[PDB]
Amino acid sequence: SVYKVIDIIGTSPTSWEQAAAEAVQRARDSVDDIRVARVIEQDMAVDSAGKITYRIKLEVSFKMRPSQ
Amino acid sequence: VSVYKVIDIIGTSPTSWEQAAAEAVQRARDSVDDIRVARVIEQDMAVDSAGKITYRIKLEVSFKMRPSQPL
Amino acid sequence: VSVYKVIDIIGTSPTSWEQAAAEAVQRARDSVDDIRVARVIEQDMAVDSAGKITYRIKLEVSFKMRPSQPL
Amino acid sequence: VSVYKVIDIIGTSPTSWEQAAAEAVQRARDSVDDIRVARVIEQDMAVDSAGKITYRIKLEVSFKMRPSQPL
Amino acid sequence: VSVYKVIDIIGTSPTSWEQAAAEAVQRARDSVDDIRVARVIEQDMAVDSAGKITYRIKLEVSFKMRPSQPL
């Protein structure tokens, strides 16, 4: 009945959707009761060749197990 | 003499935020016939226990009120 | 008990944001009798190709929900 | 459901913002019963010339948009 | 005339945010007397070294200034 909230950033060369999804799946590997991920910010990183990386910051909350 | 109402509406899709937006815009157009702009207010995802993702988006749209229509 | 609905409306005017706002409020009062305040949320101008300006203003108002009005 | 309606509503109470919010939610649930989350947008108090306080709260709620339901 | 001053004030209580607000509004009403609405701007808690909580709330109120009152 008490949850930790954290922000994470996903990235992808394909889409904000895939960057988000990757980040949520990685989070689920280790905290395992994420129900909602809220989009906080979106941006793009760009290199000199013009390759774009889509980056997305998400807020996810998870039930804290009786631990520190 | 033109007064508009503004509402928020949410679309959802397994595919994308663009698809979730398009669903909500289509449903709004079935109710009113002068929507020209829909602004993105918030985006999120819902994740079910099996890890299936649904993309969700809240849009703000305005449309001209008809005389006598309720608030 | 008493519960209220809040909505956002946009008035428009070739003259002023005050006139656009008064038009929106008067239209609102044609439907509900209990509006005593209207908060300004946003203002803009639309411009056509001749340069004719329409002042536009988004207002938030609230009013009592009547039970015989479906949500 | 691919589309959800969103509305903002205000509840009031002489006793708590929690009561003001529960009343607003329960009144909305009378009309649409799949409301699962209500977000607090704004809180205030009205104070009458005797000093009597009314707690007021504005909530945003969403629910599946029905066929033939206005936006 | 009819110019108002707008100020923020914080009330505190071990019991609730509503009581902390009531304390602040009652205190303000004995100095300035035409306060009709108090808006909640921020809420927090102070926790002491023993773990006792003090709920604290920042409110915005406006009151009519006397014709000659300094700023």
Add this chain to the structure above:
Amino acid sequence: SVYKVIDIIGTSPTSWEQAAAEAVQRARDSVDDIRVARVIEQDMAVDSAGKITYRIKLEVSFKMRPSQPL
């Protein structure tokens, strides 16, 4: 040098500019120091007959005199 900041509301049946000018002139009654007023918020009161009052909240700042309260 240190400046006090205050927020004030003016009102008018006619315009927000008048509402603002009224608030600003009242401020100028006890301080020759006001050079900018920022609009923070705008609304209208509407009475039962539907008469409108435009109201506007402004922020002003001015030098703190060594004997004034904050």
Add this chain to the structure above:
Amino acid sequence: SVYKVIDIIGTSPTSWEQAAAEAVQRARDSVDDIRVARVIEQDMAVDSAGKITYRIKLEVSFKMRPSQPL
């Protein structure tokens, strides 16, 4: 298509609408496809005599044309 966004400030002794109109016209003298100007901020400057100038900041967008720097 791709567009440029800019903020501009108009001023007037008369009204925020006139300040805004004036800035918009100025903008339109250079580009023909401004369709909306969003109000971002309003303020007033006030001189030592208490004379008021209404000032308004607006955000406008227009199609960027080859003969146009960023």
Add this chain to the structure above:
Amino acid sequence: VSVYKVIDIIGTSPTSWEQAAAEAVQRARDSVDDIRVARVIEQDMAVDSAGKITYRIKLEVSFKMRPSQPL
């Protein structure tokens, strides 16, 4: 020169937002001694299919960062 860690946590309770906030403070103090302020970030309510309400509240807390353990 000291460094502090900042985290956000959410408490919940069927009773009130004050109680939801106290549950989250209690849980935080099980791990750290020196939380002294908890700022309210957001409040909402979750409503189950039976109409039962749970009050939820997101708090931001800071405390001394110790050389061990995570940023």
Add this chain to the structure above:
Amino acid sequence: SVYKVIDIIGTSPTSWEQAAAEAVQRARDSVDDIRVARVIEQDMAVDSAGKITYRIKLEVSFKMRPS
């Protein structure tokens, strides 16, 4: 060094990503030096046949040469 910051809008019938990349590619035509573009706002234009245009407003910053 000193950088200029500008806002630009890209549009696409396909996606906000395509609208953004269009806008960034065009910016890098006038100044190759852009490394990040932050999304500021997103919206859609909808015509009377219900055809959607996705639009996105980006902030970019670049080394001021001027020149």
Add this chain to the structure above:
Amino acid sequence: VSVYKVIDIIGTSPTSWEQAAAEAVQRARDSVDDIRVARVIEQDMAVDSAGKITYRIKLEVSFKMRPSQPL
């Protein structure tokens, strides 16, 4: 019953935003000894007509209400 006033104040300095803030706080403390925290709200610079910069900073401070600081 413990109620606090909140005010905004601005300090200025040709040297730094730190010195600007410190000047404001020191002036505030000349009147009210118990100010312990000041939050930065905004920073800017005023620039004169041959390039001299003045750093300015707006701070928010709170302190227990008292009749020598009416409001």
Add this chain to the structure above:
Amino acid sequence: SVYKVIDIIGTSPTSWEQAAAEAVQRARDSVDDIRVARVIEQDMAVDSAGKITYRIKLEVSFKMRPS
């Protein structure tokens, strides 16, 4: 009377004040009427060896001159 508004970023190895001073002085090379610069955002770049650059984004306005 009409004014142009722009955002600019300055950097410094030593302070946000100096980073700001630099951006303001660079703007003044091009325009004469700048009277206020508002701070929008502050950040720091940090290289792989731990060296810090203070960066600041300012908004400035000035009268827009003919053409």
Add this chain to the structure above:
Amino acid sequence: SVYKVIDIIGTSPTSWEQAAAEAVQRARDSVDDIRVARVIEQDMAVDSAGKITYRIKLEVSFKMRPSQPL
């Protein structure tokens, strides 16, 4: 590449810059890939003697790794 983002507060009697460098330095003890720190909030504490402590809240992000559990 998935990153974690956290907020951290540095303090210093010297300046907000030095308070920021303190928090950045401390974070570098834990992770090595921090390249930018964004300022979120600034404040000061002041003691009864007028001694000031500058405080600054920074947001930083770094690639996820076992030693920095979520």
